[PDB]
Design a protein around this ligand. Structure first.
Ligand SMILES: CC(=O)SCCNC(=O)CCNC(=O)[C@H](O)C(C)(C)COP(=O)(O)OP(=O)(O)OC[C@H]1O[C@@H](n2cnc3c(N)ncnc32)[C@H](O)[C@@H]1OP(=O)(O)O
Ligand SMILES: CC(=O)SCCNC(=O)CCNC(=O)[C@H](O)C(C)(C)COP(=O)(O)OP(=O)(O)OC[C@H]1O[C@@H](n2cnc3c(N)ncnc32)[C@H](O)[C@@H]1OP(=O)(O)O
Lengths: 316, 312
């Protein structure tokens, strides 16, 4: 058996699906979008029996800026790791993770995160991969808090518009809203969400996938929405193969800090779902939420669908 | 808003599906099967706006024997409780649960369980219902351990002893199965075999492992021809075509930790595989046992939290 770098995205896709595809159905198109466009120092290490891939690990170090923010080189990520079901418990996963970890630590990494990377597949250890928690524990990852993807069927329920302060309006993005948007982001959301706007518009995001809330002239919030027309596949629709015909999703969503806790997110959410409903969306996902914000979406009949556990290893 | 007893199953099922059908798709056949066949003292209390059902609770007291076990009347169950999404946070859940708990307690119940009943829909509070834990916590329920339904696709992967034989049950096995059950699994699983056979379970849904001519273990398996709809295939609308399941599975205590469970499992999966099963579920497992199924590529799919209230 041999460990060496690999770029055979196809064979990686097949191994993924063969082992976990029932709950995380991967496609080559999503896989390549996310691996290829990621801008961090990244690598895929493969484990091989002769010519045959029997395992892999995808790992990154934070080396590229996040909006106005510089990279913190102390952070590394395990994007994913999977050993083939017929080759488990032979030391292969350990070998593969030792190699990834060794390389990251030599490049200055002190904190290793399970998922949560840019172009992540997972916000943390999926609950479907709960048995791997013990594997990560042995290696010195600490199991921390949970995150949830939520699911709902926006076709099935009708809601009363929450009552609305005057001056505010909410509309899908027009191309001339764009300078307005980036100013607002530079001001209120200048790390990861600013960066994602930047990169995502370069690889097929359209204004129609964006909803904006205004106080008179001014942009004070956004949501990113998804349907079967979106060409950029974002987290909410990663697992669209499970979601049926007329799938959708929503996230992120953000209101300028000075405008929060006055019902405006509720209004943005309502209208963002209204748009999706009018587009005939049925089942849709809201990705990567915290336990404390679930009921904000629950008011609209969303429920937790997947769970992920944050996990972090501190290098000695 | 009126609280009173209902048996309008169709209304209940519709409300069910409107609120949680995305993750727990209910059909009227399953609903009726489980409600009508349960032998406990049971009731459904509905919440109504005029003639319109806007919430319900189903609840049960353990009043009927479980195999060799006598009923313990101290145990009650909240089978399910749902208030419609447009009527939440007005006290309806509270009134329904209060009515259920008041009746159970007046009948001698001292311990209230969320799910875990005979003909349960849930082994405990689903993770999809995680926001309800607050509602129950405030009302005195303690949140305990998790259990999991596992999922796997037997169509996707291939895998690889003296006097041990595994085969689909034959009708002549009836007696041996019963004797075995009475010896090794003489509570709830014994009760299930008795009751399931009287309501449509066939010999083809049972796999037996024998040492010589002695039954020493069994599994119950499910496909799209089973007429008994048991927990592994409750949520078959989510599993695609050629769905199946497995559970329970058991080996005589005497014979465990020697690979015989593994073999019974292997052969049971083989049989399902040969029946053209794809996506299938293993219901209600403990964390400590997930890896036993995991060797065959099964993964946690749904989680449920055990929750218990002690009446004070
Ligand atoms: C950020 C994320 O990617 S989260 C997703 C994590 N991935 C998954 O859940 C995918 C499905 N699971 C898997 O692919 C695998 O089980 C993995 C990747 C988690 C583990 O890979 P494996 O190759 O089985 O791991 P490995 O064999 O190194 O170690 C596992 C165990 O096997 C045994 N083992 C280790 N080395 C050997 C050896 N040389 N000989 C025999 N047994 C061994 C040990 O008991 C070890 O115990 P541990 O759990 O305490 O470490
Ligand atoms: C075993 C099982 O069934 S597990 C599955 C449980 N079911 C579900 O998860 C389905 C989805 N959820 C639901 O159906 C509901 O949310 C339930 C059944 C959990 C609760 O139903 P509700 O009718 O919202 O409950 P109710 O309104 O009585 O109480 C909710 C809160 O609103 C409060 N409330 C009561 N009246 C009012 C009012 N007029 N205005 C605002 N709040 C109110 C209650 O005090 C309560 O707060 P508390 O928990 O801090 O005491």
């Amino acid at each position: 058996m041999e460990i060496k770098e690999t770029y055979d995205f196809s064979s990686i896709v097949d191994l993924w699906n063969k082992n976990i595809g029932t709950v995380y159905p991967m496609n080559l198109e999503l896989f390549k979008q996310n691996y290829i466009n990621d801008r961090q120092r990244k690598k895929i290490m493969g484990a091989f029996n002769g010519e045959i891939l029997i395992g892999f690990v995808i790992y990154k170090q934070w080396t590229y800026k996040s909006g106005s923010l510089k990279p913190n080189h102390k952070i590394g990520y395990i994007n994913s790791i999977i050993v083939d079901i017929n080759f488990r418990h032979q030391g292969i996963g350990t070998k593969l993770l030792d190699a990834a970890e060794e390389e990251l630590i030599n490049s200055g990494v002190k904190i290793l995160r399970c998922g949560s990377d840019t172009y992540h597949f997972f916000p943390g250890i999926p609950l479907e991969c709960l048995p791997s928690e013990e594997f990560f524990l042995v290696r010195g990852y600490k199991m921390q808090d949970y995150f949830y993807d939520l699911i709902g069927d926006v076709s099935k329920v009708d809601f009363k518009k929450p009552s609305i302060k005057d001056g505010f309006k909410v509309n899908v993005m027009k191309p001339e809203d764009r300078k307005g948007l980036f100013e607002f982001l530079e001001k209120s959301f200048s790390g990861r969400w600013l960066e994602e706007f930047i990169e995502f518009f370069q690889v097929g995001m359209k204004e129609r996938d964006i909803v904006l809330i205004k106080y008179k002239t001014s942009v004070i919030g956004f949501s990113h929405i998804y349907d079967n027309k979106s060409s950029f596949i974002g987290p909410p629709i990663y697992w669209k193969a499970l979601l049926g015909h007329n799938y959708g999703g929503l996230g992120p969503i953000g209101i300028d800090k000075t405008y929060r806790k006055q019902g405006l997110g509720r209004l943005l959410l309502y209208e963002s779902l209204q748009i999706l409903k009018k587009r005939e969306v049925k089942k849709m996902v809201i990705d990567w939420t915290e336990k404390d914000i679930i009921n904000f979406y629950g008011r609209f009949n969303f429920m937790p669908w997947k769970a992920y556990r944050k996990a972090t290893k501190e290098v000695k």
